[PDB]
Amino acid sequence: MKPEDVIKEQCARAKVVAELWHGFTGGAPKAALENLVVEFNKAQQGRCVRPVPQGGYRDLSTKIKAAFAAGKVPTMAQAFENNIALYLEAKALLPIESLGVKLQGVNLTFLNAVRFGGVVYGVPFNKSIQVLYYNKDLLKKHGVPVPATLEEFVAAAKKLSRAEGGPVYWFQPDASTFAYFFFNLGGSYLKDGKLVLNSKEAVEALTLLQNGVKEGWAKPITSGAINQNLGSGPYAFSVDTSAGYTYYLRAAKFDLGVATLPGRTKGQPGYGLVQGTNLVVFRQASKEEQAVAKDFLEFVLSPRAQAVFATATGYVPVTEGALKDPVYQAYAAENPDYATIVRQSRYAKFEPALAEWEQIRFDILGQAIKEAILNKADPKAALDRAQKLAEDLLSS
Numbered sequence: 205m206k207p208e209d210v211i212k213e214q215c216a217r218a219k220v221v222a223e224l225w226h227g228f229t230g231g232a233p234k235a236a237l238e239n240l241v242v243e244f245n246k247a248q249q250g251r252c253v254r255p256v257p258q259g260g261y262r263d264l265s266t267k268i269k270a271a272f273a274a275g276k277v278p279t280m281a282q283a284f285e286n287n288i289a290l291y292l293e294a295k296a297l298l299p300i301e302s303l304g305v306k307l308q309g310v311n312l313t314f315l316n317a318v319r320f321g322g323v324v325y326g327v328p329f330n331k332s333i334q335v336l337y338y339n340k341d342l343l344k345k346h347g348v349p350v351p352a353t354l355e356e357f358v359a360a361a362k363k364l365s366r367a368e369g370g371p372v373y374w375f376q377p378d379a380s381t382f383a384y385f386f387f388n389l390g391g392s393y394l395k396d397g398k399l400v401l402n403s404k405e406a407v408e409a410l411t412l413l414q415n416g417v418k419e420g421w422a423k424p425i426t427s428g429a430i431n432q433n434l435g436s437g438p439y440a441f442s443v444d445t446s447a448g449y450t451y452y453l454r455a456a457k458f459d460l461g462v463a464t465l466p467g468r469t470k471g472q473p474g475y476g477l478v479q480g481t482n483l484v485v486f487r488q489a490s491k492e493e494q495a496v497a498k499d500f501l502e503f504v505l506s507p508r509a510q511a512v513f514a515t516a517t518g519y520v521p522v523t524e525g526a527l528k529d530p531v532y533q534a535y536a537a538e539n540p541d542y543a544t545i546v547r548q549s550r551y552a553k554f555e556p557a558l559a560e561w562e563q564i565r566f567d568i569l570g571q572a573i574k575e576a577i578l579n580k581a582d583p584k585a586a587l588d589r590a591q592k593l594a595e596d597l598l599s600s
């Protein structure tokens with residue numbers, strides 16, 4: 205019996221059920237969420253959370269949009285910072301501390317990101333950082349150190365690619381991969397509060413990827429996740445969400461490494477994109493539903509729940525207390541990758557929290573990166589188009 209079967213049963217015998225719409229399609233993240241919910245439901249007296257899978261995160265936002273039109277929101281959902289900004293336009297969200305959920309010791313990297321007009325509207329739950337995944341076997345084979353700088357990263361990819369006869373830096377042509385290169389070549393999306401997609405650092409970042417493809421050291425992955433493509437051709441590195449850890453581990457036929465991101469200099473690791481989601485609570489939910497939300501959120505923020513979630517998935521523990529939990533400690537003592545993910549979570553950048561950001565990152569920025577990388581569109585012309593489309597979307 206799967207944990208979602210156990211939850212369906214707990215929920216059947218409950219007098220209040222708080223629905224939690226999420227965007228986990230399976231693997232470790234879906235299992236860890238459900239296991240956490242099973243445990244919460246068991247300590248309650250007929251008060252339950254029902255996790256409802258809505259597809260991926262994009263399917264999730266579309267389902268929540270539909271929910272607003274219909275006037276039937278769930279009690280909780282996962283949200284990106286930009287989803288929070290959008291739901292706040294609708295005034296759809298309960299201030300988190302109005303529930304009496306205590307947030308002291310939540311990492312300010314995550315807590316800052318859920319604060320709008322000084323008010324916290326989300327609980328950091330499943331927060332990821334990009335890390336460098338690598339093939340320790342293939343690097344040892346050719347005597348190539350883990351690269352510490354972007355310069356060493358490009359040299360390693362070129363040297364390994366020539367040795368193995370194939371592009372060893374694997375990347376998705378998407379906003380998430382672009383963010384790593386953009387941020388770490390000095391880029392910033394907002395200039396005096398205006399969204400700029402076509403700055404010289406944008407052009408430089410997209411050019412580096414496109415030159416990578418031409419020169420034969422960067423391999424665009426067009427079909428499924430990087431971890432879904434492992435096994436065809438030599439692989440040295442990717443830059444990818446920490447929540448892909450269990451996916452990399454299950455798929456890898458080689459000894460998997462995790463490192464901090466290459467930076468401009470050895471003085472500091474590069475910045476990683478913060479991804480995954482916060483839990484929000486909808487004004488429309490009943491007093492009783494909101495009360496279960498309140499208890500669920502205190503449970504999810506407990507050191508044990510965060511320790512178990514983070515060690516099962518590769519997400520970043522969102523609390524100082526999680527790091528002092530002995531379950532976390534015992535995982536970290538036998539697996540240094542958990543410390544690597546925490547170390548990398550210190551060098552952490554967000555995309556803009558604009559209501560329209562979801563549409564822009566996929567259908568505009570995402571497209572322009574695909575045009576340059578897959579159709580050999582001029583990097584600057586592809587981003588000049590993106591800038592034009594985003595300004596049309598954002599205008600007035």
Ligand SMILES: Nc1nc2c(ncn2[C@@H]2O[C@H](COP(=O)(O)O[C@H]3[C@@H](O)[C@H](n4ccc(=O)[nH]c4=O)O[C@@H]3CO)[C@H]3CC(O)(O)C[C@H]32)c(=O)[nH]1
Nearest residue numbers: 228233261262284286332380429445447448451479480562
């Ligand atoms: N809607 C919307 N999505 C957004 C936004 N910002 C970023 N993202 C997407 O967040 C994903 C990273 O979030 P994360 O929770 O760190 O990782 C996910 C999965 O990515 C990852 N996974 C799943 C299957 C698999 O084979 N491998 C694997 O690594 O496991 C986790 C649960 O699904 C990226 C994925 C993307 O959709 O291509 C674009 C990115 C936004 O603002 N809105």
Ligand code: NA
Nearest residue numbers: 228229230231
């Ligand atoms: Na999955």
